[PDB]
Structures are given as structure tokens and as C-alpha cells.
């Protein structure tokens, strides 16, 4: 119920209209991030770098796994 006649008297006009569309998600897919590379053909030239890489990953992975396990333990079968 926009009054375009009054609005144009103070310098307001419409310059375009469009429909409104929202998003709903029905199906889901699985995407896994493989954090450990295959280094078989590097003939153990990257032992020290990989070991430090795994050490750094645990400081991030462990808190998320704890948060995930905290909610999962409160979910029980309906019966």
C-alpha cells in the first residue's frame, strides 16, 4: 500500500520491483576433510614436518570433538 503520488511530491520514487525467494534444504551430502596427506612416494623425507603438523592439529581437533561428544551423550533412544 505504498502511496507513490505523495512520495514523489517529496522526491521519492520506485526504481524497480522483484520477487522474494528463500532457501530450504531437503537432502544433505557428506564431505570429509582428510587432514593427513599421502606421503608414501616422498620416502620418509617429511617425518619431522608431519609430526609437528599432527601435534598442532590436536590443539584444534580435541576441543571440537569434546563439544560434539557432549551433545551426543544427551541424545537417547525414544524408548
Amino acid at each position: 500500500q505504498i502511496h507513490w503520488g505523495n512520495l514523489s511530491k517529496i522526491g521519492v520514487v520506485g526504481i524497480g520491483s522483484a520477487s522474494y525467494k528463500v532457501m530450504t534444504r531437503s537432502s544433505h551430502q557428506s564431505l570429509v576433510i582428510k587432514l593427513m596427506p599421502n606421503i608414501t612416494l616422498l620416502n620418509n623425507c617429511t617425518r619431522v614436518e608431519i609430526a609437528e603438523y599432527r601435534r598442532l592439529l590436536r590443539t584444534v581437533l580435541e576441543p571440537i570433538r569434546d563439544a560434539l561428544n557432549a551433545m551426543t551423550q544427551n541424545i537417547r533412544p525414544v524408548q
Binding site: I33, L35, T72
Partner: protein, 372 residues
Amino acid sequence: GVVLAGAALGVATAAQITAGIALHQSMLNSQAIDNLRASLETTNQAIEAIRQAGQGMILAVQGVQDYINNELIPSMNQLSCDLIGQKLGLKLLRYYTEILSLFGPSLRDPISAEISIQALSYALGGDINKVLEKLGYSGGDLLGILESRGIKARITHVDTESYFIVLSIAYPTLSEIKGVIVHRLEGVSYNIGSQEWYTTVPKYVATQGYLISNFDESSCTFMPEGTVCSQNALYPMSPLLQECLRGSTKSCARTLVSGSFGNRFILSQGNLIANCASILCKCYTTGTIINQDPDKILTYIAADHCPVVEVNGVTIQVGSRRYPDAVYLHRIDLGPPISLGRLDVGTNLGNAIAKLEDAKELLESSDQILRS
């Protein structure tokens, strides 16, 4: 069917509860995780699909495998063992920095967090085009969905022993809300004497029948086939602002404009609406200057009195009359002047509340004075 143990949980928001329960349906069971672990330990590609029995495929992405396969392995016989380790360590630490950026303490409530596919770009190897292709996400709506951050992922499983994260990703489908129209509003300044004013209105408004609502364009992409929003863009508009858009000109606030202002004319319905007191309007057909009467605030130019008009050094040919000739200022009720600066608002609100606090006793006795 599962039940949430509220007493043990204690406190949880609606988003946490909804995301926690959905974790029972979107999470691979213990057998599928064990099967996934074995399959991951046999692949050497950056992007690869894992097929497991009668289940939807799991797309495995390794963030530094392209560099290992394309850069390090071919140079294995040429570079020394020490140099090979130094180059991979540089990429591993840079990959960790992006993992920490995305999944570290900056991530608030990982259970309920929804991460866009663009935020995952570095974790997926620096690009998302092949990931989208391998997931089957395509069609005529892909650009609109992608630009509004419609593709989102949820964390469903973190495996510390084998170092992988399982995400749940969905390609959304678009549904048009029936009867909702999003309007784009543009303004032209006007002059009251020597002062140039400008009506304050929202950039976008939404209507549904006789309802008028605000519209947030932050999560929306304006496509030629309709605006596409990944969140809810409609939020309520105050009654005073709704009065303005319904025809009450005295309910619309106005503000002063700077010296150099870019909106002093507009083309609307084939007619030119110009603040001819602040720009030079000249009729090109007859060569005469169009003068704005000081008792008018705007000029509406149509082909009846000026078929071709020069407005700002730009020559425009206008169509037939669609806006009536300008009315006098005394037939227009103008709204209150405002200043939209943050510190101008606080300075003026403080002055206003100080006056209300000084006259508190008189305002309390609103019935002891009227009934006397």
C-alpha cells in the same frame, strides 16, 4: 526417533537443540566411520569420491595433495631429502593456520555453526569449483545461491585418531514467497529557499498486500529473476515509517545534504524529476533555462512543455506526462529535520531527555491540569 535429555543438558538454546538432534540423522554410524577410515588411508588424490554400499557418496578432500602430487613428487630425484621436507613443512603450517582460523576458538558453538562453502575454500585446497562439480551442485540457480552464501556445511564428526573432519553440506532449493514484492527506493533532493533537503527512506522495502516491512539486503543477491536470500530478510517497520510510505508526508524525516550531492535529478516513468534550483536545467528544444519557482521544491519535466531537456550537461528526451506539475510548498506538509550521524543522534537525544526530566512534575500531572 530420539529424545533429548533436558535435565542432564540443563541449558541450551533453540538452535543448539535443533542442531544437536539433527546430529543423530546426519552422522555416519560407528561402522561407517571405520569403513571411512580404511578408505581414506588408500587414496592419494586431492578430491575423490568414496562409494560405500547403498549409501550416499562421501567426498574426500585433502588440502595439500595437489602440491605433493604436482610439485614435490616430480622433483623427487632432483631435490635433496632435506629440501623436500622444508617445502612441505611450509605448506603444512600455512594449512594449519587456516584450520585454526576456521575451527579454532574463533568458532562459537561448533554444534550450531553453519559454515559457508566459501569460508571452506582454503581447507578444500584453495578452490571450490571442482568440489561443487563433484557434489553435483549445478543448474540455473547456482550463481544466485552461491553469491548469497546459500551453500552451508555443519560439523558432524571429528576424528582425532585419523585426523579428519566430516561435514554435512546441503544444496538448497529456492521457493518464491507468494505476494511479497521488494521495492527499491531512490530519492532526489529538493530546495526550501537556499537549503537543499533530502527525504530519509529505506533503500529497500517489502510489501505483501497492504503490509509494509523493512528489508535487509545483507544476505541477498539481486538476480534478474528475483532477489535470492539465504536468511530471512523481512523485519518489521515502525508504524511512523509505515505512515510515511502510505502517504503521510509529514511523517517522513528529512536531512540536509552536502555541497556536492549526486542525486539532484532522476528519470522515472519517462519523466525527469529534477531539483532545478540546485542544478542548471535547460530546455534543449527551445534553448530556454528552466527556472524552479522558489515556492516550489521540485520540477517535473515531461514532453508536453519540454520534449528534450539538458539537465547536468546530459541531454535527455522525455516522454508524455506522468507526474503532475509541481505544487506549491504550502500544499505539502514536510516532516521533521533530522541528522543521521551517530554522535548527532546522541547529542540531540540527550538534550531532549534533559527537557523531559526538567518537566517531569508537569508531565506527571496530566490529569490534574486537563480536568481544571
